[PDB]
Design a protein around this ligand. Structure first.
Ligand SMILES: Clc1cccc(N[C@@H](Cc2ccccc2)c2ccc(Cl)nc2)c1
Ligand SMILES: Clc1cccc(N[C@@H](Cc2ccccc2)c2ccc(Cl)nc2)c1
Ligand SMILES: Clc1cccc(N[C@@H](Cc2ccccc2)c2ccc(Cl)nc2)c1
Ligand SMILES: Clc1cccc(N[C@@H](Cc2ccccc2)c2ccc(Cl)nc2)c1
Ligand SMILES: C[C@](N)(Cc1c[nH]c2ccccc12)C(=O)O
Ligand SMILES: C[C@](N)(Cc1c[nH]c2ccccc12)C(=O)O
Ligand SMILES: C[C@](N)(Cc1c[nH]c2ccccc12)C(=O)O
Ligand SMILES: C[C@](N)(Cc1c[nH]c2ccccc12)C(=O)O
Lengths: 318, 314, 317, 314
């Protein structure tokens, strides 16, 4: 096949209509405004192409076959890589002054909101809480279909080692944390009645409340309904299982996936931050995977993590 | 206007035809191959949009009005900025393994050459040496004045070159010949040590290079041989801007010359990356060389002719 | 000279002391925490080296000689270039997990604040509102900031003089006459819903455009801290924006553009620092706000006062 | 601990000695020349810290315990991440003109070669084929096992190579010989097509060359290949069965080694460009075999299938 014909450059390179040129006097910098946003759209199509393929692997039960975890992780990594380039793409619009923008602003009258249909589909398909005709069919499908947050949440609940009958990760974790905090209180109370001792008693009482808050299923159920948390309590246990036992072969690639989901999340946030900066330059943590950020910030000592029995060691291996 | 309608996303987001899907079994990674090269093409259209606008400012005599130098420099800077992003865009294809590429390679059979019409137009329009409707644009790119040619014409008009006036080349040759003579006297005075012969050899090598600058005949030979592109009078004008860059009238032209070299090595880095990508998946001469050359003539600061108060106000 | 001796690599490559290793068990990832922050410090030293040299060109009156504007602009550009790399440097710490960080936090107990002396000196020297270090920290607050030195230079902008050109007078006359002519065009339209939306949008934009000429409102915000540049420096900055094409204002426009880049790059670095702190531990102040403000007054091109041939030759090299 | 004391900023921020300032007239831009190369050195120390830790995991037999593969892959990724930043660091020196460089070049007289001890140790420790105290570390780097050597030893232990069980090389040779024969039959059926007959004969020679142990043994001795023939079989096993859980992280490692390799080459390319910019690279890559094995264009269906006994094992 011929390069231009394979890429359909007859459509791609014939979609640049300068509204200034069309409505009278052509403003040169307006071409940049078209090309930059068209390039963002090409990349949003690729991000959606990868996101939907990953979403489908989970939905159609393929993610159960652990062989597919290489494909799942690599595609999510490609999404973060594409998002890193889109964040760098703001440097192109930075070459157009706010003064030069004003010379063509009246020909298109740009709103400051996120007018991209693809970006709204991307936000909905990942799991963002938060006028289009025919496009409202795709937008309704994005809200109705299972989000990546939902599909990951369902998969996280199936994490091995959670079963109370076998291994019982949450039970052993609560036992080691309660016994570890009690052993730390004994070490702190042993010290002299100095001001440095009372600063440690107050800091220990604050950290003890935080550590034990992890086990309050009712507090989590309250935050879930309040919107302050998105993952189910059983999915929190499964995500923490993967974090604490990431070295175990069966949990190595799932850990890369969880790391990748947090990267995509903060990359989406950096892109939105840059969009807002650009809007104000020219005119003047509600993250999908907050639970993953939360579980990684519970400062639990390495030695308090329950040990792995030789029956569980051979089970969490390929 | 509406976002999707203004951007004509009905054409842009409906031009992705996977040859694997069309010819039977759809290969997922093939979509990346389409989108990456389509995005390169959108940026080549923008690069050409800027390059042609700058090329026209020179061709239509607007570059004579010095007020347009902000517009010329800023648009050339935007070209280097876009080129920096295109070099970074290779990281996207780096996320596709050579093994995964092979699974769709047979559906399109990719040649290793630079099959982009826009990139060939970009190369010809800057000044890189040399279907049916597309062949009209490809012929026009070779026939029309290149950016190298338009810059060369403008460089010949640089103030300060006139032999009656300041006579830059004459004073430069006089200070360099006298500076080299003064250095030879200092070097020959030393004892016959190994450190002295290292200085005699290094001086004789630098002397040959410094005086080579004034050999108009040698330059005329290299120009015809293709090893040099700028006319001898344009070399003098470019060096005038380099040596007197601090002077207000030469501040923005210096930024322009700096920018042309940036674009040059960025085009070369993009071509280098293209070759790396081709070998990664299959396995199988700079336009402004004179500007790079003039910036590496290692001429001492004090040998540069001083500026008279009449030339300083000018 | 010898490479390692010239660079003093005997100090540079012998300043990495892992507190985990020294206090018992060595944690591998802790070396990254040292190297990243040391590399930020090397770049802060270079940023300060450039910032102070530019600050001095203004303070010693060299910035008066327009020949020095290439040196001023290029060094400020180098600062933005270095800042772009420091923002990209967050990708290195991103390769260390919050879990691995916990394994060595406790050996150093890191505070979430901006504990860098060099970064505080950089903030103070640009114009952001102990012991031997306290001498440099006091000097940074006492000496003239880059905002102050640029403000003084902006007040000397040619074309502001009321006797000759009178930029602010002609600008107020064209904006007041342009808004009046626009009100006449808007009132002429039929009683449609699109007409009432334009009457409301015009009344809002008219209030904003005329606010530019309210010296009292600006003097109030200046004292409140909500604005930093003097009213005469605002006029000078707007003169450079509107007549940026004019040769004498080409490089000063690049400088003003560069100051805004550095400003939002400093803000992006601070934003990234906050993100990194919350990533590892868990849960506006723009020096040149006036320049951002003057660039977003959406004044039509034709309303800008025209340039007379006497002013054209004056603003030329 | 306190920020500046923890970082030992008393040494770090007091090691900038401008040779121009010390030898008389201080040149401002010379500070950038010091800081850029000092920052490269801080990162080379970190790259070596990671490279040696990974090198040790292989050397001390920890890489046998597959649990350590997350630590191995993530640290090798961190090396590529740091190398990406060092390639981007050339943009800082790009802000210093060749003309401004000349104003301080005489105070240090810079050579065009790679004068970094740390970079030479990095090259030797990966597997690339000053004096005194430094010569002890430089000798140790050549004598100790390289990353190429440690990876080569590990690759020879790849499961599935055993001729009794699975016999990967045997089944691969059988399917490739039968597949090429079936392709020859399809091609010879067409009329005298001639571009496909010539391209088939060339590709057939390349595909079968994979099984010529003698040709590989010759190239290995000649230096044109670095990995042992048994390590090539093991690397190809990981490539073809990358989807298999036990080969997922090893495939990431092999991909990462090639990324580090081409990033080292891009850094060297940029160093050469920078040297020529201020004054007047090729396929000699440590992991050439990994690049080679990834570009053998063997059809997906010719890859031997996986039996349920081998599927549960991997
Ligand atoms: Cl192509 C186009 C057409 C109509 C509006 C926009 N608005 C921009 C925002 C923006 C506004 C003023 C100056 C710079 C940028 C925009 C960008 C991205 C998204 Cl998702 N929505 C919106 C752009
Ligand atoms: Cl979209 C398309 C269609 C047909 C051929 C190519 N060839 C690529 C080169 C390339 C080849 C194999 C693997 C990676 C890259 C190409 C890229 C850019 C240019 Cl200007 N010409 C050519 C691409
Ligand atoms: Cl080298 C060192 C020593 C002691 C504290 C810090 N604090 C970091 C902030 C930070 C905290 C936890 C995890 C990641 C980052 C820091 C970085 C930059 C600055 Cl200016 N101040 C502070 C670092
Ligand atoms: Cl800090 C220092 C001291 C003495 C020599 C070099 N040479 C540079 C090369 C280079 C030469 C001229 C202009 C720009 C760069 C260099 C850089 C990196 C390495 Cl590994 N070796 C060498 C630098
Ligand atoms: C067989 C399985 N894929 C088990 C599973 C689910 N989530 C996981 C996370 C890490 C490791 C394994 C799992 C399944 O039940 O789908
Ligand atoms: C009036 C003029 N623009 C002079 C000119 C030509 N090349 C230059 C370079 C630097 C500064 C000025 C010039 C012209 O002759 O076009
Ligand atoms: C001679 C002068 N540089 C004039 C000056 C002041 N501000 C400016 C802004 C743009 C251009 C020139 C100026 C001076 O007064 O320092
Ligand atoms: C136990 C083992 N790590 C097996 C092994 C060697 N190379 C491999 C590559 C991929 C997967 C496993 C291996 C060893 O022999 O060291």
């Amino acid at each position: 096949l011929i390069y231009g014909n394979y890429l359909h450059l007859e459509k791609v390179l014939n979609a640049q209509e300068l509204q200034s040129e069309t409505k009278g006097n052509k403003i040169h910098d307006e071409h940049l405004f078209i090309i930059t946003h068209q390039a963002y759209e090409l990349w949003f199509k690729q991000i959606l192409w990868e996101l939907d393929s990953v979403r489908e692997i989970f939905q159609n039960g393929h993610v159960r076959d652990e062989r597919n975890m290489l494909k799942v992780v690599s595609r999510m990594h490609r999404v973060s890589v594409i998002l890193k380039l889109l964040v760098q793409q703001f440097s192109i619009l930075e070459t157009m002054t706010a003064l030069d923008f004003n010379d063509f602003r009246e020909y298109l009258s740009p709103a400051s909101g996120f007018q991209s249909l693809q970006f709204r589909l991307l936000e909905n398909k990942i799991g963002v809480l938060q006028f289009k005709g025919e496009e409202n069919e795709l937008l309704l499908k994005s809200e109705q279909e299972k989000t990546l947050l939902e599909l990951v949440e369902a998969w996280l609940e199936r994490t091995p080692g959670l079963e109370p009958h076998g291994f019982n990760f949450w039970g052993k974790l609560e036992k080691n944390i309660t016994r570890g905090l009690e052993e730390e209180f004994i070490r702190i109370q042993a010290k002299e009645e100095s001001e440095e001792k009372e600063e440690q008693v107050a800091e220990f009482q604050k950290q003890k409340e935080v550590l034990l808050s992890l086990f309050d299923e009712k507090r989590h159920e309250h935050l879930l309904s309040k919107g302050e948390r998105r993952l189910s309590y059983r999915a929190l246990q499964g995500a923490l299982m993967i974090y604490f036992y990431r070295e175990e072969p069966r949990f190595q690639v799932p850990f890369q996936l969880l790391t990748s989901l947090m990267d995509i999340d903060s990359l989406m946030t950096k892109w939105r931050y840059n969009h807002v900066c650009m809007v104000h330059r020219m005119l003047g943590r509600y993250k999908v995977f907050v639970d993953l950020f939360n579980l990684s910030t519970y400062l639990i000592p390495r030695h308090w993590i329950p040990k792995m029995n030789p029956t569980i060691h051979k089970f969490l291996e390929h």
